[PDB]
Design a protein around this motif. Structure first.
Motif, short mmCIF file in Angstrom:
data_model
loop_
_atom_site.label_atom_id
_atom_site.label_comp_id
_atom_site.label_asym_id
_atom_site.label_seq_id
_atom_site.Cartn_x
_atom_site.Cartn_y
_atom_site.Cartn_z
N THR G 12 -15.38 -17.91 -47.23
CA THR G 12 -16.02 -19.17 -47.62
C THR G 12 -16.56 -19.92 -46.41
OG1 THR G 12 -14.46 -19.38 -49.47
CG2 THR G 12 -15.76 -21.33 -48.91
N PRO G 13 -17.62 -19.39 -45.79
CA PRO G 13 -18.16 -20.07 -44.63
C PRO G 13 -19.08 -21.20 -45.06
CG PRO G 13 -19.51 -18.22 -45.09
CD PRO G 13 -18.38 -18.16 -46.09
N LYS G 14 -19.39 -21.23 -46.36
CA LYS G 14 -20.30 -22.23 -46.92
C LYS G 14 -21.66 -21.84 -46.36
CE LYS G 14 -19.29 -27.15 -47.97
NZ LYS G 14 -20.51 -27.73 -48.61
N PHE G 15 -21.64 -21.31 -45.14
CA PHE G 15 -22.81 -20.82 -44.42
C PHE G 15 -22.19 -19.81 -43.46
CE2 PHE G 15 -24.48 -25.03 -45.63
CZ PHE G 15 -23.36 -25.84 -45.46
N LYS G 16 -22.70 -18.59 -43.42
CA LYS G 16 -22.11 -17.54 -42.57
C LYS G 16 -22.12 -17.72 -41.06
CE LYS G 16 -23.80 -13.51 -42.85
NZ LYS G 16 -23.90 -12.17 -42.23
N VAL G 17 -22.61 -18.85 -40.57
CA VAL G 17 -22.63 -19.08 -39.13
C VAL G 17 -21.32 -19.69 -38.65
CG1 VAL G 17 -25.08 -19.14 -38.70
CG2 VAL G 17 -23.95 -21.17 -39.68
N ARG G 18 -20.52 -20.18 -39.59
CA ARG G 18 -19.23 -20.78 -39.28
C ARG G 18 -18.12 -19.74 -39.16
NH1 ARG G 18 -18.75 -26.45 -42.72
NH2 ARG G 18 -20.64 -27.42 -41.84
N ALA G 19 -18.49 -18.46 -39.21
CA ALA G 19 -17.53 -17.35 -39.11
C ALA G 19 -17.15 -17.08 -37.66
CB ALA G 19 -18.14 -16.10 -39.72
N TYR G 20 -15.88 -16.71 -37.41
CA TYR G 20 -15.47 -16.43 -36.03
C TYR G 20 -14.28 -15.51 -35.76
CZ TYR G 20 -12.13 -20.38 -36.57
OH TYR G 20 -11.15 -21.26 -36.97
N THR G 21 -14.59 -14.37 -35.15
CA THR G 21 -13.63 -13.33 -34.76
C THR G 21 -12.12 -13.52 -34.91
OG1 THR G 21 -14.17 -14.09 -32.53
CG2 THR G 21 -15.05 -11.95 -33.23
N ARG G 22 -11.50 -14.31 -34.02
CA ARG G 22 -10.04 -14.54 -34.03
C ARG G 22 -9.24 -13.27 -33.78
NH1 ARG G 22 -7.59 -19.56 -33.41
NH2 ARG G 22 -8.59 -21.09 -34.83
N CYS G 23 -8.14 -13.40 -33.04
CA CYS G 23 -7.32 -12.23 -32.75
C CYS G 23 -6.58 -11.82 -34.00
CB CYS G 23 -6.32 -12.51 -31.64
SG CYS G 23 -5.51 -11.00 -31.09
N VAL G 24 -6.53 -10.51 -34.22
CA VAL G 24 -5.87 -9.97 -35.38
C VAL G 24 -4.41 -9.69 -35.04
CG1 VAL G 24 -6.27 -7.54 -34.87
CG2 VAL G 24 -6.14 -8.33 -37.24
N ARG G 25 -3.85 -10.51 -34.16
CA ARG G 25 -2.46 -10.34 -33.75
C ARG G 25 -1.82 -11.58 -33.17
NH1 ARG G 25 -0.04 -6.09 -29.26
NH2 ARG G 25 1.77 -7.40 -28.75
N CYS G 26 -2.62 -12.42 -32.50
CA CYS G 26 -2.11 -13.66 -31.91
C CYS G 26 -3.00 -14.83 -32.27
CB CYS G 26 -2.04 -13.53 -30.38
SG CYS G 26 -3.62 -13.33 -29.57
N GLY G 27 -4.18 -14.53 -32.80
CA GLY G 27 -5.12 -15.56 -33.20
C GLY G 27 -5.98 -16.03 -32.05
N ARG G 28 -5.75 -15.44 -30.88
CA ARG G 28 -6.49 -15.79 -29.68
C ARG G 28 -7.99 -15.70 -29.90
NH1 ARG G 28 -7.03 -15.60 -24.37
NH2 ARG G 28 -7.84 -17.69 -23.86
N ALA G 29 -8.55 -16.76 -30.48
CA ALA G 29 -9.98 -16.86 -30.76
C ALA G 29 -10.87 -16.70 -29.52
CB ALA G 29 -10.26 -18.20 -31.43
N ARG G 30 -10.39 -17.21 -28.39
CA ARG G 30 -11.12 -17.24 -27.13
C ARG G 30 -11.74 -16.02 -26.48
NH1 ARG G 30 -11.78 -22.83 -25.73
NH2 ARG G 30 -13.89 -22.56 -24.85
N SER G 31 -11.19 -14.83 -26.64
CA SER G 31 -11.84 -13.69 -25.99
C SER G 31 -11.54 -12.40 -26.70
CB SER G 31 -11.41 -13.59 -24.52
OG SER G 31 -10.01 -13.39 -24.43
N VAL G 32 -11.77 -12.44 -28.01
CA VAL G 32 -11.53 -11.33 -28.92
C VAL G 32 -12.58 -10.23 -28.86
CG1 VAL G 32 -10.19 -12.49 -30.67
CG2 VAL G 32 -12.62 -12.84 -30.54
N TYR G 33 -12.15 -9.01 -28.58
CA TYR G 33 -13.07 -7.89 -28.53
C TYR G 33 -13.31 -7.45 -29.97
CZ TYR G 33 -13.00 -7.08 -23.44
OH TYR G 33 -13.14 -7.13 -22.06
N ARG G 34 -14.52 -6.96 -30.28
CA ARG G 34 -14.86 -6.52 -31.63
C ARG G 34 -14.22 -5.19 -32.00
NH1 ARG G 34 -21.44 -7.39 -31.76
NH2 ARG G 34 -21.48 -9.57 -32.49
N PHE G 35 -14.52 -4.18 -31.20
CA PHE G 35 -14.03 -2.83 -31.37
C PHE G 35 -12.54 -2.73 -31.62
CE2 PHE G 35 -14.70 1.76 -30.29
CZ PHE G 35 -13.38 2.16 -30.11
#
Ligand code: MG
Ligand code: MG
Ligand code: MG
Ligand code: MG
Ligand code: MG
Ligand code: MG
Ligand code: MG
Ligand code: MG
Ligand code: MG
Ligand code: ZN
Lengths: 127, 206, 125, 98, 80, 155, 60, 24
Positions: G12-35
């Motif tokens: 529910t981004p309301k608009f897909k630009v509000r979407a953001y990676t986030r760590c899938v283990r600690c939530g560390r949004a700051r430097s999350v690698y995609r792969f």
RNA sequence: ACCCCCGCCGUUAGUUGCCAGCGGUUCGGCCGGGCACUCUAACGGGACUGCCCGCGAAAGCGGGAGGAAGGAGGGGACGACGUCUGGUCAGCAUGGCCCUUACGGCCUGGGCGACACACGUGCUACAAUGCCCACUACAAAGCGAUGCCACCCGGCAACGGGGAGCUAAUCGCAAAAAGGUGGGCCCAGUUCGGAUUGGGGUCUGCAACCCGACCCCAUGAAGCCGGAAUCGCUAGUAAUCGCGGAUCAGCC
């Protein structure tokens, strides 16, 4: 009939094919003086020939790919040096003392982290 | 604050990965998050069994998982009733449809993770740290091993000042890239705080 | 030859020379010469009275140049300045308009540094 | 003319794998184009060593992917017999397009 | 040298709320958080009060200031 | 250099005169490793020494270097308080480094808009015994022999 | 990295630009690698354990 | 130089194309 | 030292490669064909003061031959017992203290982008060993599914429309730039230098006032080589030139 010698330098590979003839050189098609159109160094490549009074006695077809026309000039110089040995293996005696049969191992140095260029270290002020 | 993980450092040699399966781009991140979900429960459950490693191989919707334990019994269950609960609790996590083998640990006294947890526990029960440590090094050193070493973090004995305890015997060359040193870390929640436990065991060499 | 509002570019290539006009740049240069079909390389002095008329007429009548232009621009600024326009306030206050940093580097818009007394021991390095 | 393309993380889990495929079908089809290598694609992950600051910590991690080809022209039933269901490695994953 | 393209944007909170007032002529005030919207003629004459991010400032919208974007008339920061 | 006695890099002779000293001079002209432009400039210059001078360029060059090599130079030194400038000989090695450096420097100090010329004309002037290059050289010796009192701090 | 702020998974981004990676283990949004779905830290932690399949230590 | 956005280098430096560094 | 990358040689493997060697050609290695060569990636060899002369008690130092290479051949990974009450509870974990209609939670908008000023790290530059236009030549390592974008068209252009191939040694990003050749500039704040500002416009995104990048026109600032003081680097290093990537809608 024909002679071979590869030759690599600072990341360049040169296929050197000597063949008893006039003394011309076809580098990747263009004439020796055509590929290296205006490079005060070019003359170097054929130095291994003048080494044993060749050139005006041989001929050379050369394939060159990789690096820069300067590195190629040294790969080719090594090629013409090697090939010139498969022909007469007796050339070493005079061709080597000049060091033409060496493969300059000087390559770019890895760019280490923390530093700007492998060595060039960032500067500080009132440290 | 120096020195690398002795395992990660040797991964190329004397030490294989815990998850050996190909994948890529669109999957890899999904196919990995899973592995962690897996390991997640196993460690949360099979504690008393004596966890030590969770190999996870793959090929396609038929996962591997080969939990390694000291007490393979506790794992399996009565006649094999628990290996039913888990093995099922597993697919309720990954529709993937996966196995669940169980190998036994030949002397948990050469399993850094175990020796660690071993010590981590004692410390939680309020045993004398230095003792527990020396003992541990002995056990490990006293049953094979060409070298061992244990390290406890700080707040030893609940002391207001965080300390750091040692203990070591025989060669334990962290520098030699070919040693084959088992590394094991154990936490240790406590009334006064967390205290990490590190176990290092050296075996053969080449 | 004198062209637009008090314009007298001379003894240089015509293009270059036309550049010496307020509203003409290296762009309009090759064009005004392009259309009016004149060698750009001709030295303004070596030009022809015929060419100087086609240029004088084509240019003066095709683009808004010199004074009349500065009049426009000035006129513009005055506008966004009269209306509460933020962009206009940036003109009044004399600070950069195109959203740049004004904590450092704005000298081209502020003028010479106007040093004041300060706070030492507090590593302002 | 069955083109096989093998990719793996371990340069042995392939030379082993793709090599089985060579010795096998070498008794039911052509003679195989031999397992031809193919450039490896490396992924680098340069990460700051510790959390909070220390911009110059770093330490490099790479995930190199290897490839193999082979190529069996003259497909002959038994080839698709010695191969069809007799593999072994787990750190491998194939893709074939005859 | 600003630019949006093809489709002058204007949030329809105040839009369909400003023209509704065009039916009875005008009105006496408005107030939108949509400082993101461009100004269209229908706004002229009106008096929309924009949000500082703290206050609702009264902005009389005249012709000379059409093409602009409301917020450009409701200063954010406080200086000197 | 705390350990070894850092040996001198030996340079590959000239691609025309096969003279190493020339390469050296060309390297001192070079900047940003654009060694081609550097080689050119020195050769264009050699051909400018041929025209305006009926002599062989190579000999004009060597002659120049010769007049520009300082034989005595002053080296600072702390001796009881003040820093007395002690006068002393100049190694054969250092003489060259300085000579060549000075030439290129004075050469780029000349007016003529063309790089290749400044070198051409500088070399010649140097040969005759005039020019900014030889100035510095004679200035150096003057500096020493004018401080030849503190020369008992031989060094 | 507050549970509350892990509404990122909310789609529910309301608009897909509000979407953001986030760590899938600690939530560390700051430097999350995609792969990996992991942040620079966790990526390093796991690479050390061997839980990152075929992710050896680089060097050259 | 590398800084003039309306020249060859200025475009190359800024890694772009336009009337001054067309595609070809 | 054992591991990785670069130097030389060989084996295996050839849809990378080349008339090397032959026939054809829209003469593009395009076609057949061929693995030789370059190369691709896997393995094997090679260096050890091993051999020769000199000194030495020995270690080893000097010298010489062969060799691609040496006396640690060149660059990485790798950091001892400990020190600084070093750094991080804001990545995560965790003792204790504190808040619970809130020191929690949602939202819209603003702020993190403010400025009289001070400093650090940098970019661009002050020009002729240079700048501009054109023509023409050599690279490596990377990345590509709604993603790279061939080619064709509309636009000065950013970019838009159309659309092939690629699932990527076989298609695309891609043009390498410096360089070579020819022309222009002619020493001037200039065909140096691009700040700043006016206008038009593209693109992403619900949305670009605050506060995006890009294009085109006009504008065309300071700057003519930098006080005291101060930084880097010992060779393929410094210096200089362009190319890729991660993050990532876009992008400072
Ligand atoms: Mg470099
Ligand atoms: Mg985002
Ligand atoms: Mg310019
Ligand atoms: Mg001996
Ligand atoms: Mg070591
Ligand atoms: Mg402290
Ligand atoms: Mg602090
Ligand atoms: Mg900030
Ligand atoms: Mg067009
Ligand atoms: Zn994380």
């Amino acid at each position: 009939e024909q002679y071979y010698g590869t030759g690599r330098r600072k990341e360049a590979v040169a296929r050197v094919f000597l063949r008893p003839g006039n003394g011309k050189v076809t580098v990747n098609g263009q004439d020796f003086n055509e590929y290296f159109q205006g490079l005060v160094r070019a003359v170097a490549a054929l130095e291994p020939l003048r080494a044993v009074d060749a050139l005006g006695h041989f001929d050379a077809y050369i394939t060159v790919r990789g690096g820069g026309k300067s590195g190629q000039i040294d790969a080719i110089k090594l090629g013409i040096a090697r090939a010139l040995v498969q022909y007469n293996p007796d050339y070493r005696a005079k061709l080597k003392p000049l060091g033409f049969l060496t493969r300059d191992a000087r390559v770019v140095e890895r760019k280490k982290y923390g530093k700007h260029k492998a060595r060039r270290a960032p500067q500080y002020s009132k440290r | 604050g120096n020195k690398i993980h002795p395992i990660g450092f040797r991964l190329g040699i004397t030490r294989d990965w815990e998850s050996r399966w190909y994948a890529g781009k669109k999957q890899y991140r999904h196919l990995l998050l899973e592995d962690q979900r897996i390991r997640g429960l196993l460690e949360k459950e099979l504690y008393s069994a004596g966890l030590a490693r969770v190999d996870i191989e793959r090929a396609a919707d038929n996962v591997a998982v080969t939990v390694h334990v000291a007490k393979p019994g506790v794992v399996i269950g009565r006649g094999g009733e628990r290996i039913r609960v888990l093995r099922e609790e597993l697919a309720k996590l990954t529709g993937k449809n996966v196995a669940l083998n169980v190998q036994e640990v030949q002397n948990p006294n050469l399993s850094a993770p175990l020796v660690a947890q071993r010590v981590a526990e004692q410390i939680e029960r309020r045993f004398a740290v230095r003792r527990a440590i020396k003992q541990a090094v002995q056990r490990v050193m006293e049953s094979g091993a060409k070298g061992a070493k244990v390290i406890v973090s700080g707040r030893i004995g609940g002391a207001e000042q965080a300390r750091t305890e040692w203990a070591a015997q025989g060669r334990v060359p962290l520098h030699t890239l070919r040693a084959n040193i088992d590394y094991g870390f154990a936490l240790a929640r406590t009334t006064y705080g967390v205290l990490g436990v590190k176990a290092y065991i050296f075996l053969g060499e080449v | 030859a004198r062209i637009a509002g008090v314009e007298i570019p001379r003894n240089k290539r015509v293009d270059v020379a036309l550049t010496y006009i307020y509203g003409i740049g290296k762009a309009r240069a090759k064009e005004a010469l392009e259309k009016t079909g004149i060698n750009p390389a001709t030295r303004v002095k070596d030009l022809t009275e015929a060419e100087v008329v086609r240029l004088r007429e084509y240019v003066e009548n095709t683009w808004k140049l010199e004074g009349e232009l500065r009049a426009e621009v000035a006129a513009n600024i005055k506008r966004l300045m009269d209306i509460g326009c933020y962009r206009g306030l940036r003109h009044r206050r004399g600070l950069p308009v195109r959203g740049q940093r004004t904590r450092t580097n704005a000298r081209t818009r502020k003028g010479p540094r106007k040093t004041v007394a300060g706070k030492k021991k507090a590593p302002r390095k | 003319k069955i083109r096989i393309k093998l990719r793996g993380f371990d340069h042995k889990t392939l030379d082993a794998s793709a090599q089985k495929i060579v010795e096998a079908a070498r008794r039911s089809g052509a003679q195989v184009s031999g397992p031809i290598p193919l450039p490896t694609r490396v992924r680098r992950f340069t990460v700051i060593r510790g959390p909070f600051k220390h911009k110059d910590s770093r330490e490099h991690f790479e995930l190199r992917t290897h490839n193999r080809l082979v190529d069996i022209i003259n497909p002959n039933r038994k080839t698709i017999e010695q191969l069809m269901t007799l593999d072994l490695p787990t750190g491998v994953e194939i893709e074939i397009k005859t | 040298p600003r630019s949006l393209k093809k489709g002058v944007f204007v949030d329809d909170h105040l839009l369909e709320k400003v023209l509704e007032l065009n039916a009875k002529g005008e009105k006496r005030l408005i107030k939108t958080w949509s400082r993101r919207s461009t100004i269209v003629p229908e706004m002229v004459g009106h008096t929309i009060a924009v949000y500082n991010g703290k206050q609702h400032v009264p902005v009389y919208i005249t012709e000379n200031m059409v093409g602009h974007k409301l917020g450009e008339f409701a200063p954010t920061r406080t200086y000197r | 250099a705390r350990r070894r006695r850092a040996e001198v890099r030996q340079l590959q002779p000239d691609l025309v005169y096969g003279d190493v000293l020339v390469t050296a001079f060309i390297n001192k002209i070079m900047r940003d490793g654009k060694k081609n432009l550097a080689a050119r400039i020195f050769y264009d210059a050699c051909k400018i020494i041929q025209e305006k001078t009926g002599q062989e360029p190579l000999k004009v060059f060597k002659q120049a270097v010769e007049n520009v090599k300082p034989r005595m130079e002053v080296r600072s030194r702390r001796v009881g308080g003040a820093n007395y400038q002690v006068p002393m000989e100049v190694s054969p090695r250092r003489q060259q480094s300085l000579a060549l450096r000075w030439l290129v420097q004075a050469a780029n100090q000349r007016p003529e808009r063309r790089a290749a010329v400044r070198i051409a004309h500088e070399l010649m002037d140097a040969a005759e015994g005039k020019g900014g290059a030889v100035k510095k050289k004679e200035d150096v010796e003057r500096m020493a022999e004018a401080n030849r009192a503190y020369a008992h701090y031989r060094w | 990295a507050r549970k509350a702020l892990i509404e990122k998974a909310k789609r529910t981004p309301k608009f897909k630009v509000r979407a953001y990676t986030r760590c899938v283990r600690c939530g560390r949004a700051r430097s999350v690698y995609r792969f990996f779905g992991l942040c620079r830290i966790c990526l390093r932690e796991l690479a050390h354990k061997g839980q990152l399949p075929g992710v050896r230590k680089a060097s050259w | 130089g590398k800084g003039d956005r309306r020249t060859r280098r200025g475009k190359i430096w800024r890694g772009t194309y336009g009337k001054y560094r067309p595609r070809k």
